[PDB]
């Protein structure tokens, strides 16, 4: 199936009552206007975006009568830092940019890919993590 | 006068009753062991920490019945950077860092020198700011 436009985006999974046939991109291919995957179901895609469109997390690419074909990025290992003050999070931030490693800023908290070594460097900060796994929904804009 | 070792620290400069004969310093001081220069008030001051001693803002180095010579850094122009969320600190903060430029993240403001050439990155962030004059009060930790 070739998709040249986004024919929709759930903004509330919950609410979706057709069954979500996603298709699981990397977080690197948020933004971009070509890609070619298939979906969990295995159904081909290839997406050429026609206009000014670039992909993001919950764009809906087709729908059906019971099924819609939608994208999320994939569920990775990261770290979850969870500054708990204004200062820990400019604090930790700062360091993380300084090291130009890519990361997501949601509300209060700092989400990286899994990498031991900067554990040393949140210690030193000082600031509260976990690992866990978790999808990056924003693309990082490489300013 | 040598200095070899500190003799108070000023925690609050109101409840000081003797004159304060300031010894301004560079941002770049703050930690340092070693240090020649003359107060504000032409008092020769060489200083040569012995222990592990690091030049503090408010380090108090002498003091005599009517007057206290102590460390401050300089007052010098500066972006006072204010984001209002967690968000837009963790953002701000980290752009700064990825232009590996020098700050001081106190509370809830990010101190940077003046350089218009990040005006166009505040603003990109989206964050509110305003030119002043300020002393960097904690030492720079080259992470
Ligand atoms: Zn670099």
Redesign the interface.
Known sequence: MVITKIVGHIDDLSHQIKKVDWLEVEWEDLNKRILRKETENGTDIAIKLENSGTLRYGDVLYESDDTLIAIRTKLEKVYVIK?QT??E????????????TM?I????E?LVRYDKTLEK?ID?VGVSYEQSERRFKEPFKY?
Request: charged share 35%; glycine share 8%.
């Open positions: 500054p204004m200062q999070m400019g604090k930790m931030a700062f360091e993380i940019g300084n090291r130009h990361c800023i949601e509300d209060d700092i460097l030193e300013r």
